Subunit: 121 residues, 4 copies
């Protein structure tokens, strides 16, 4: 069971390595249905982004995780297909859980999976 409330991990399918320095923006949908900034960061050398939120701050609701894939590919001299990659999901609606959002990137393709686990507390 992952100890991280909201972990984001990104891989590069072209190089077979972590996707380093990918800008990640997380938003939380409010009562009126609008998106508000929730947390932000960039992937480390491991391709993982640690420190997005504590369980206390990660309240029940719909979340949007945005990966700036365009800037990632353009920095390498590649003109990608997508404007960005977005993962939208409902979280903690049936008790608190720990989430890991994983993404695999290619210039014209991306895949994403989620690993949901229930912590000790």
């Amino acid at each position: 069971e992952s100890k991280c409330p909201l972990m984001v991990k990104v891989l590069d399918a072209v190089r077979g390595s972590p996707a380093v320095d990918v800008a990640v923006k997380v938003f939380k949908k409010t009562a009126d249905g609008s998106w508000e900034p929730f947390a932000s960061g960039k992937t480390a050398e491991s391709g993982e982004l640690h420190g997005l939120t504590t369980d206390e701050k990660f309240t029940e609701g719909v979340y949007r995780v945005e990966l700036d894939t365009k800037s990632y590919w353009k920095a390498l001299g590649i003109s990608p297909f997508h404007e960005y990659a977005e993962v939208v999901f409902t979280a903690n609606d049936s008790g608190h859980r720990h989430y890991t959002i994983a993404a695999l990137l290619s210039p014209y393709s991306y895949s994403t999976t989620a690993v949901v686990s229930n912590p000790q507390n």
Copy 2:
């Protein structure tokens, strides 16, 4: 009519085309807003045709939204994602044919674009 934009969806659990997946296509407007561009449901083939024409499908940023949540729920499955969206710039250099492919699983999905042109 012609089809410069196509959407093809597969179901990874049943090993077949994803039927009745609700799709909504939007196009970015002059001042940054999204305007409804096209809509429909995937057929028995998992493909959605007749979305637009080469004349209507002009240069710009497009957003393709697949209602994966409803699709899985109607199959008695509680999926992870609310939906799956694909955002891209199209026809920035001429007028090509775009095929947005998607592979669905309850907690995962992959999407790929196949861009083509009248090759010889």
Copy 3:
């Protein structure tokens, strides 16, 4: 045109069909050794048709091997995989139509099967 066994290959890097990919299909014998069943190369559409017919495509275990190494090498890329292979038992139950789809990247690939109903 093909009917029982089809192979479709896409390129996730270039956003296009993977053309001229060498495909080899093997089949398990009575004892337990692989045996050449069919071969070909993907066309411009990224598809390989005419591998067999409903008559020769009998029940058993098959192995579809895609020469991905040569595909990437020709583009100047040194991929991870020696090749991509799909092993499955076919027509064990009913004689349906099989489509093996593959999405390729230098260090990654995904394969999916679409088994179509013989009745409807």
Copy 4:
């Protein structure tokens, strides 16, 4: 703790690690024959560590086979594939660290490799 070769498997239907998946690793010989190299089963994390060491994991062509059929069948699911095979050349260009990742669905799977430089 592991270092040279690691295997990680995820379940796309349940959104969790794929536990107890049987893994068998083979290494090619001089005449092109495969010989047993290492084997084990994924733990609760969905990972398999300690398959080999740097001294043991020398240059060569390896074959990593995941028994995906048994995994799905045990859950009552009828999968398409007999297994998922990952064939690759290793340590040819210096002794690196390899991570073979796989995401499983009943009728589909994707595999990715993460190659890193340890004390390079």
